[PDB]
Amino acid sequence: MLVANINGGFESTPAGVVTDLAEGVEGWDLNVGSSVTNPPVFEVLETSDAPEGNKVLAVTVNGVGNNPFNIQATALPVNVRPGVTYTYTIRARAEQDGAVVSFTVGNQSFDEYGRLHHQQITTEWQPFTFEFTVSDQETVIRAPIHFGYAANVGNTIYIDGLAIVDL
Numbered sequence: 001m002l003v004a005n006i007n008g009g010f011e012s013t014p015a016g017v018v019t020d021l022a023e024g025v026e027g028w029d030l031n032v033g034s035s036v037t038n039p040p041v042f043e044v045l046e047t048s049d050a051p052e053g054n055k056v057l058a059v060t061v062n063g064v065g066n067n068p069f070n071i072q073a074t075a076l077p078v079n080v081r082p083g084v085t086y087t088y089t090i091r092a093r094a095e096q097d098g099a100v101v102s103f104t105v106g107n108q109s110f111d112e113y114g115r116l117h118h119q120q121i122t123t124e125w126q127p128f129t130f131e132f133t134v135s136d137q138e139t140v141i142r143a144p145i146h147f148g149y150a151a152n153v154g155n156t157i158y159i160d161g162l163a164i165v166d167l
């Protein structure tokens with residue numbers, strides 16, 4: 001397979017709670033803003049339920065901040081070419097009903113090329129997919145997933161199998 005992103009299925013990362021948010025997960029930047037006074041738990045889980053490989057990322061939300069991105073997992077680097085159109089695909093589910101996630105892609109100036117907005121995550125694995133075009137001259141971009149929605153408090157959201165593919 002060919003993908004723009006790195007370690008899209010967390011298969012590179014040792015199982016366990018992630019405390020090193022910026023660099024503990026190859027291919028990813030995890031970020032919790034200081035406005036999040038009850039911080040989440042990020043965990044790489046080894047599980048037979050994994051859509052891809054043996055591992056998933058789990059995000060347990062115990063509170064939120066001011067903006068959905070104050071709890072986020074961002075794929076970086078994402079290696080792309082100007083003008084090219086890409087397909088984004090990921091799988092997600094949640095421990096409980098009611099979860100909300102936005103799946104986005106943007107440049108280092110935080111301008112979004114596209115997103116899936118307030119996706120309704122269920123207790124069953126589902127694919128979430130969209131297309132975007134790199135409409136500027138960037139070659140290295142990023143893919144922020146936003147979890148800091150108030151509706152997610154008391155839930156755990158699981159993601160796996162991020163694949164950004166040359167359409």
Ligand SMILES: O[C@@H]1[C@@H](O)[C@H](O[C@@H]2CO[C@@H](O[C@@H]3CO[C@@H](O[C@@H]4CO[C@@H](O[C@@H]5CO[C@@H](O)[C@H](O)[C@H]5O)[C@H](O)[C@H]4O)[C@H](O)[C@H]3O)[C@H](O)[C@H]2O)OC[C@H]1O
Pocket residue numbers: 031069072074104106109110111112115116117144
């Ligand atoms: O520590 C640092 C981090 O702070 C930094 O995080 C990045 C900050 O920038 C973030 O990007 C912003 C995300 O919010 C976007 O605005 C959204 C766009 O979507 C609008 O919703 C639309 C509603 O209609 C739908 O049809 C449509 O699909 C939706 O888009 C929504 O109302 C807006 O609020 C801003 O445009 C972005 O700039 C980025 O995600 C973070 O990763 O990262 C660096 C780190 O050092």
Ligand SMILES: [Ca+2]
Pocket residue numbers: 008009010011050051052053054055056160161
């Ligand atoms: Ca996986």
Ligand SMILES: [Ca+2]
Pocket residue numbers: 022023024025026027028029030076
């Ligand atoms: Ca990183």
